[model samples]
Target chain A: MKKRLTITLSESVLENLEKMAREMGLSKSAMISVALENYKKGQ
Target chain B: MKKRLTITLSESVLENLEKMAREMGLSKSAMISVALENYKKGQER
Candidate 1:
């Protein structure tokens, strides 16, 4: 199942997110998903 | 400035997110913010 959640991000982070998303050929949402996965792994 | 963005997440991740959010005493959005921050730091290395 997939869930849609709203998140508030700082301006700088949002800017970096857009850049990273384009560089990785992913949507901003997908980039965030990847980040959450990595964050889960690091914990 | 803060902006709200909607993102899709898997069920397991959502569950974990809820747990993590409660553990850290942060809203879901704040937890994600921290995760993004960590992700950024990881990328910078």
Candidate 2:
């Protein structure tokens, strides 16, 4: 099940994510998913 | 004091991080620091 979440993040982090996502042609959600998945794998 | 540590990551993940870092003209450590700091903000501290 793909659950949509409305999570909150620090201001600077969100800005950085948006900038990175825009540069990479990805949506903010997609960028967050990739990062979180990478973290999950390491855990 | 700055502590240095070595860590292991999956090939694909590191590749993605490196790619992003290159795109942003930032060092790999800089990119990782940003990501980790974001995570820490959302953690229960």
Candidate 3:
């Protein structure tokens, strides 16, 4: 719901997101949401 | 949980928070959190 994008991530981690999104047939936004949800779930 | 903060506002702005909290019977932290939730809901629509 918030609109801020200052979370810290290394360059390699950022590149990993793009790569994972590409492989999973998701846009970068979806990939990020998935990752965040997973983190919240402790999985 | 994360722990970091960088805020930009006048001292009056912060004092206003205390005033509002006192009037509403809420802690300053709760007021800040509630306001943040509202801002998120408003803009995400």
| Candidate whose TM-score is highest | 1
In candidate 3 chain B, where is summed lDDT lowest over 10 consecutive residues? Answer: B1-10
Task: Identify the runs in model 2 with alpha carbons over 4 angstroms from their true place.
Answer: A1-43, B43-45
Native contacts matched by each model: 0.81, 0.02, 0.00
Comparison by TM-score, 1 against 2, better one? 1
Give a tens-digit lDDT track for model 2, residues B1-45. Answer: 232334445565566767776877976656665564555455423
Residue lDDT tens for model 1, A8-36: 88898788889878989999878877887
Q: Which stretches of candidate 3 lie over 4 Å from their true place?
A: A1-43, B1-8
Interface RMSD of each: 1.4, 12.3, 12.6
> How is the predicted docking of candidate 3 categorized under the CAPRI scheme?
incorrect
Accuracy of chain B in candidate 2 (TM-score): 0.76
What TM-score results for chain B when candidate 3 is compared with the true chain B?
Answer: 0.71
Residues B1-45 of candidate 1 have per-residue lDDT tens digits of 889888888888888889888989999877877887898889774
Of the pair 2 and 3, which is ahead by TM-score?
A: 2
> For residues B1-45, what per-residue lDDT tens digits would candidate 3 score against the true structure?
332233333454455556665767976544544443343344343
- Superposed on all Cα atoms, the candidates' RMSDs to the truth, in angstroms, are 1.6, 13.5, 13.5
RMSD, candidate 1, Å:
1.6
